[PDB]
Design an enzyme around this catalytic site. Structure first.
Site, PDB file in Angstrom:
ATOM      1  N   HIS A  78       3.117  -6.314 -13.374  1.00 18.20           N
ATOM      2  CA  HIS A  78       3.155  -4.836 -13.315  1.00 18.20           C
ATOM      3  C   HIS A  78       4.441  -4.413 -12.617  1.00 18.20           C
ATOM      4  CE1 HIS A  78       1.151  -5.520  -9.343  1.00 18.20           C
ATOM      5  NE2 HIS A  78       1.652  -4.355  -8.974  1.00 18.20           N
ATOM      6  N   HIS A  80       5.485  -2.976  -9.793  1.00 16.39           N
ATOM      7  CA  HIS A  80       5.735  -2.844  -8.355  1.00 16.39           C
ATOM      8  C   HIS A  80       6.742  -3.904  -7.891  1.00 16.39           C
ATOM      9  CE1 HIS A  80       1.813  -0.510  -7.198  1.00 16.39           C
ATOM     10  NE2 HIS A  80       2.831   0.307  -7.411  1.00 16.39           N
ATOM     11  N   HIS A 141      -5.560  -1.929 -10.144  1.00 13.62           N
ATOM     12  CA  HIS A 141      -4.598  -1.912  -9.066  1.00 13.62           C
ATOM     13  C   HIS A 141      -3.444  -0.966  -9.399  1.00 13.62           C
ATOM     14  CE1 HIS A 141      -1.574  -3.072  -6.187  1.00 13.62           C
ATOM     15  NE2 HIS A 141      -0.764  -3.336  -7.191  1.00 13.62           N
ATOM     16  N   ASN A 172      -3.052  -1.945  -1.124  1.00 14.49           N
ATOM     17  CA  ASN A 172      -2.220  -0.822  -1.513  1.00 14.49           C
ATOM     18  C   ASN A 172      -2.739  -0.106  -2.751  1.00 14.49           C
ATOM     19  OD1 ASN A 172      -0.080   0.948  -1.692  1.00 14.49           O
ATOM     20  ND2 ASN A 172       1.132  -0.494  -2.906  1.00 14.49           N
TER      21      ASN A 172
HETATM   22  N1  LIG Z   1       5.095   4.085  -6.307  1.00 16.10           N
HETATM   23  C1  LIG Z   1       5.503   3.793  -4.980  1.00 16.10           C
HETATM   24  C2  LIG Z   1       5.333   2.300  -4.702  1.00 16.10           C
HETATM   25  C3  LIG Z   1       6.341   1.404  -5.033  1.00 16.10           C
HETATM   26  C4  LIG Z   1       6.178   0.030  -4.781  1.00 16.10           C
HETATM   27  C5  LIG Z   1       5.016  -0.440  -4.170  1.00 16.10           C
HETATM   28  C6  LIG Z   1       4.831  -1.954  -3.945  1.00 16.10           C
HETATM   29  O1  LIG Z   1       5.794  -2.712  -3.996  1.00 16.10           O
HETATM   30  N2  LIG Z   1       3.523  -2.539  -3.742  1.00 16.10           N
HETATM   31  C7  LIG Z   1       3.357  -3.977  -3.653  1.00 16.10           C
HETATM   32  C8  LIG Z   1       3.402  -4.607  -2.318  1.00 16.10           C
HETATM   33  C9  LIG Z   1       2.019  -4.716  -1.706  1.00 16.10           C
HETATM   34  C10 LIG Z   1       1.903  -4.514  -0.334  1.00 16.10           C
HETATM   35  C11 LIG Z   1       0.624  -4.582   0.251  1.00 16.10           C
HETATM   36  C12 LIG Z   1      -0.507  -4.855  -0.545  1.00 16.10           C
HETATM   37  C13 LIG Z   1      -0.367  -5.078  -1.910  1.00 16.10           C
HETATM   38  C14 LIG Z   1      -1.560  -5.314  -2.813  1.00 16.10           C
HETATM   39  O2  LIG Z   1      -1.514  -5.976  -3.888  1.00 16.10           O
HETATM   40  O3  LIG Z   1      -2.628  -4.725  -2.502  1.00 16.10           O
HETATM   41  C15 LIG Z   1       0.910  -4.983  -2.482  1.00 16.10           C
HETATM   42  O4  LIG Z   1       1.079  -5.200  -3.925  1.00 16.10           O
HETATM   43  B1  LIG Z   1       1.919  -4.191  -4.467  1.00 16.10           B
HETATM   44  O5  LIG Z   1       2.184  -4.622  -6.069  1.00 16.10           O
HETATM   45  O6  LIG Z   1       0.969  -2.825  -4.473  1.00 16.10           O
HETATM   46  C16 LIG Z   1       4.011   0.465  -3.881  1.00 16.10           C
HETATM   47  C17 LIG Z   1       4.155   1.825  -4.117  1.00 16.10           C
HETATM   48 ZN   LIG Z   2       1.253  -3.477  -7.119  1.00 15.32          ZN
HETATM   49 ZN   LIG Z   3       0.318  -6.771  -4.824  1.00 12.50          ZN
END
Ligand SMILES: NCc1ccc(C(=O)N[C@H]2Cc3cccc(C(=O)O)c3O[B-]2(O)O)cc1
Ligand SMILES: [Zn+2]
Ligand SMILES: [Zn+2]
EC number: 3.5.2.6
Length: 219
Positions: A78, A80, A141, A172
Site C-alpha cells: 500500500h 504508506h 488498514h 495507525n
Molecule cells: N496520510 C498521512 C500518512 C502518511 C504516511 C503514514 C505512514 O507511513 N504509516 C506507516 C507507519 C506506521 C507507524 C505506526 C504503525 C503502523 C501500522 O501498521 O499500524 C504504521 O504502518 B503505516 O503503513 O500506517 C501515515 C499517514
Molecule cells: Zn500503512
Molecule cells: Zn504499517
C-alpha cells in the site's frame, strides 16, 4: 531460524524456508517493519520496500550480496512510507515496482514516484520457479491494502492489514476503514483456508491466529 543483521542492527533478515526470508527494518515514527525476500532462479523479489531510500538501498545491497543475484521486482502492498518509502531507489535502479492502480494513484497523490499499477484484484505472477499471488481483499488498514500469497508454501504476507500478537490496538488508523476492515479480513480467511505462516506488517510472524487477533482488535 537463521537470522542475519546489517552492520548496524537496523536491518535484519530471517529465514522462513530455503527460498523465503522475512526482512525487517527499524524506522522512526522507533518502529519495526516487515516484508519478504524471495530467492528465485530469475532473481530476488521483495514484498515491500522500506521506510526510506537509505534503508531500501541497504536492504537491496545486503540481499544481493548474500544471495548473489539481483533484486528484479518489488511488490508494494500500500502507499504508506513503511511500504513505498524506497520507491525512488527502485525506479532509478531499474527494479520493477508492482502495485494496484489505486496504490499508484495514492502514491502520486502523496508525492511519491509511481509504481506500475499493474496488479488487479487477483494477480498471479511467477518468478522463475516462485509463484506469487496478490489479492486485494477490500479496505482496512488503508483503502488500497493488498495481501500476498505464496501458494507453494501457504505463506501469507498480511502487511499492515494484519496485526501481530504484540499489537494491542489497531495502531495507525488515520487512513483506515474500521467498518470494512473486518470484512476484508474475512475475505482473506475465505480465500486462504489453510495457512502455514502469516507475516504481519509489523511484529512477529504468526499464523491464522493473527487474522483472528485483528478481528478482535476491531470490536
Ligand atoms: N496520510 C498521512 C500518512 C502518511 C504516511 C503514514 C505512514 O507511513 N504509516 C506507516 C507507519 C506506521 C507507524 C505506526 C504503525 C503502523 C501500522 O501498521 O499500524 C504504521 O504502518 B503505516 O503503513 O500506517 C501515515 C499517514
Ligand atoms: Zn500503512
Ligand atoms: Zn504499517
Amino acid at each position: 531460524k537463521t537470522v542475519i543483521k546489517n552492520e548496524t542492527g537496523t536491518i535484519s533478515i530471517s529465514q522462513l524456508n530455503k527460498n523465503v526470508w522475512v526482512h525487517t527494518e527499524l524506522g522512526s515514527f522507533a518502529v519495526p517493519s516487515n516484508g519478504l525476500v524471495l530467492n528465485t532462479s530469475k532473481g530476488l523479489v521483495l514484498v515491500d520496500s522500506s521506510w526510506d531510500d537509505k534503508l531500501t538501498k541497504e536492504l537491496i545491497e545486503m540481499v544481493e550480496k548474500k544471495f548473489q543475484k539481483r533484486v528484479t521486482d518489488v511488490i508494494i502492498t500500500h502507499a504508506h512510507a513503511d511500504r513505498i518509502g524506497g520507491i525512488k531507489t527502485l525506479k532509478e535502479r531499474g527494479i520493477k515496482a508492482h502495485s494496484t492502480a489505486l496504490t499508484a494513484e495514492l502514491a502520486k497523490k502523496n508525492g511519491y514516484e509511481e509504481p506500475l499499477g499493474d496488479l488487479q484484484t487477483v494477480t498471479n505472477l511467477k518468478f522463475g520457479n516462485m509463484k506469487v499471488e496478490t489479492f486485494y481483499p477490500g479496505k482496512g488498514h488503508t483503502e488500497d491494502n493488498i495481501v500476498v500469497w505464496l501458494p507453494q508454501y501457504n505463506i501469507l504476507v498480511g502487511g499492515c492489514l494484519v496485526k501481530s500478537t504484540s499489537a494491542k490496538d489497531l495502531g495507525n488508523v488515520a487512513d483506515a476503514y474500521v467498518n470494512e476492515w473486518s470484512t476484508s479480513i474475512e475475505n482473506v480467511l475465505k480465500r486462504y483456508r489453510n495457512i502455514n505462516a502469516v507475516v504481519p506488517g509489523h511484529g512477529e510472524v504468526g499464523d491464522k491466529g493473527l487474522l483472528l487477533h485483528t478481528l478482535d482488535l476491531l470490536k
